[model samples]
Target: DLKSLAKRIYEAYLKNFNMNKVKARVILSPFVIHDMETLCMAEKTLVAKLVANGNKEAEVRIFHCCQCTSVETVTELTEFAKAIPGFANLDLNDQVTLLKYGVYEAIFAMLSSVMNKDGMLVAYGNGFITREFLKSLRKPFCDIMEPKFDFAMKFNALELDDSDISLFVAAIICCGDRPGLLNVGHIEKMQEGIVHVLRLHLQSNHPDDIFLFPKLLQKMADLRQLVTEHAQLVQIIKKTESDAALHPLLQEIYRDMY
Candidate 1:
């Protein structure tokens, strides 16, 4: 049954091609940094000017960057979800709810594919910001990404390939616990199916690493915790820096929760 379901899900997502092709097409060279000091200095200059002008203006600019990244992240994850076997079959409202709650976690996971301990690329291929540079960001702003980085470093250690990530992301989207679901049974069934396939896949692909599948399952729990903390960080940003409003869709999700 798992073999059938796994084959079906894999083919559903891959269609005619393999995961390698999808990986190549989806991942482009993101923001690159030739000179970190110069870039940081330039960024600081703009930040200084904005801060000197007024907190309102600076916060708005910050919000704009946040909105931009969120939009890009959602766009990519939405495409990823569309490829999952049963994602589009869900009720339209359920689709939105899944994306709203699951996109950030998916984004963080996808990003892990590109990140290393040294640094990460950002801004959709326009900037390669370093880990230290990112840490230098203001309080809650810095907090927003640190958890993701920490998770990425460990997740990367698993050495999962692109196909593995594809199934894992599908599993994340199909989670039954996300709020406001109309078809909990259906969702849970799909989630379990994906997890089953994921386990089989990892077992077959990494014969030497017997623990990989269970480790990945544990990482799913870890991802939930990361997202919860991420939500809290977003709330703090909304409260302290009101001008830096979250994206409209994100705002709606957060507002509904409260």
Candidate 2:
């Protein structure tokens, strides 16, 4: 049952994120981030204003880039969410609630593909910006990117590859326990099935790593923490920044925008 379920999600994952992105020309290469600093220095591509460090222009670019990518991901992720078996059958409000709270976690889940301990691919993978530089941005902006880099770096070590990531991210989105959920039982069953499939996949693909499954489950807990921390940063930005603009969709997800 979940075999067919896994195939459907894998199809959507391929279409929405991985293979589809290749046509768009954003190659998420693992090796690129390692030499990213050298590439930027040689090409002088001006990726994230390398070494500007905490200027208004630099932080604003960082803010805008994050917003842009989040929009890119959320749009595709909404489609992928619907492709998951039980998600579309849920009540409309429940669907929105799940996506609203779950979208950032899902975004970060997929983002690891374009990232490493040193840097992340940006501007559609044409350029890379270092984590050391991102963490040097103004107070709150640095705070935000730092934890994300930390999470992505450690999460990358599991080496789950594209297939395992598809199920893991699907399971995160289908979380039955997110607050404001109207149909917890139904959603929980969906999550259980997705997690079951993920476990099976990991077993077949990574039997050498005996505890990879539990470690990944722990990451789900870590992602929830990241989201909570992110919400606080959103609050701080709203209260402090004069010219900040959270995207329309993000504003809507966080609360009413207009």
Candidate 3:
């Protein structure tokens, strides 16, 4: 079990997500929730479009841009999964399924990077759209953003570094929660070790927060609920905002759920 016991120098390659849009100063927008349809496309291209147009206004476009960054996070997460030790050993379909179900959980955990209590860094740091602005968005959109921000803020409270954070992402990936999972025991074994190392991280670093391990586990439960609420919002988007340009991969993940 050395392979399981040996925690690799798993760093923040996944968690250290980079925002490609032009980096901005810590300019805070007091507006929290001016929400609307969010993130249509992602990466540098759409940012370029927005930068050229200089249109960070209009509640609608801001939300659409929010949805856009929802783009490559799945692929980014999938690539990170392939780099891990035991994950590749699973069946291909299972790998895809794990990624499908786990990514919503994974993405929000990683999102803590771009976000702070004040606001989130959007459009490659160009848009420091305030938390207030996010809250002010229209319904359903407004609805989803609340728990998303709440979970991130609370997770940040623990102050764990990337060493623990990466393992936690891997924890959710192989957490063995999916229905059609075939390698349940093996996946659970991997997750158990992953969680063990996570505790080690807490013991070594967060000694004062004695209850942090269970608190961290509880956050896992919380993120799962966040994903369900997110899916419900996705349903509304599809039914209502027919023109919304959700990423095809995101579309795939969202459609499979009940």
Candidate 4:
């Protein structure tokens, strides 16, 4: 429980995350990049060294998120890095740079064989993994333990059979709210489903349910603020006097917000 009790470290990680991508983008992304071809070539060489060096358990997965329009997208891409790719010639700093660029698809192809089986999504929301980002690995190695879901669930549920659920979600994001494919509602509903399952399936004996659950709530609060901000931006874009002249980036995002 030493890692769990390391409140000081978690607090610092949180602070840095608030300013950046938190554990999802800030931490795991850097680790996964070591195997990405765009970033790090020669994965076979790196893996051999790790095995030779005695860290035999180390493995990598690759996944991606499209345009990374939300925390979900960011989290997925980060997970891809953990579950598939390996670290060969790339250093921590180099890995960070690659994650920043959103380049990690090759790793996703590898993870598809192991965890995803089906495929990953690029864009998520309204049901389906629509947009695909750079690739990385699957969970267990690293993942975004969302605030809406307790850490116990995030950590422990990693071992459970998530294939069905993950595939269902992937369909939702990549496809559409395809007639009974998924329930059509606010994004919060889908978010809640993920958190609920993670918690129900993963919380352990004598779990710190009270403490960990509250932290998850706080993270959800942060997400609420982000969604609100995006909503306001959407309104601004909608009411803009010259939508035609809006920057391409502005247009793409404004559509998403609206």
Q: For every model shown, what is its TM-score relative to the native structure?
A: 0.78, 0.83, 0.79, 0.26
lDDT of 2 by residue, 159-236 (tens): 777778888889898888777888899999988878889888888889899999999999999988888778789779
lDDT tens digits by residue: candidate 4, 1-258: 322322222233233222222222222221223333522322243333423442222222121122223333345444433321121123454333333322212122112222221222111111111011222333222322121122223433333223322321221222112122222343234334444443443344225443554443453344334434444643553464232133344344344332
Estimate every model's Cα lDDT from 0 to 1: 0.70, 0.75, 0.67, 0.30
Kindly list the per-residue Cα lDDT of model 1 for residues 1-258, writing each as its tens digit. 766655665554454222233443355423444354545444455335544542454324545665666776676667667766678898999889888888777767877865767676555434455676657666767676577789988998888776677788788888898888999998888788778788888888789999998888788888877877777878887888856867787777566553
Better of 2 and 4 by TM-score: 2
- Winner on lDDT between 1 and 2 is 2
lDDT string for model 3 (1-258, tens) is: 433432452543433455311222234322223233233223224355654663543444555665666666776677778646678898887788888899889888877756777677665554445677667766656665667778878888777666667777777887777867888887787677677777776676777889988998998898888888888877887678745556666788887664
lDDT value for model 1: 0.70
Order of models, best lDDT first: 2, 1, 3, 4
Q: Which stretches of candidate 2 lie over 4 Å from their true place?
A: 18-56, 256-258
Worst 10 residues of 3 by lDDT: 20-29
Instruction: Please tell me which predicted candidate would have the highest TM-score against the true structure.
Output: 2
Off by over 4 Å in 1: 1-37, 40-63
Top-lDDT candidate index: 2
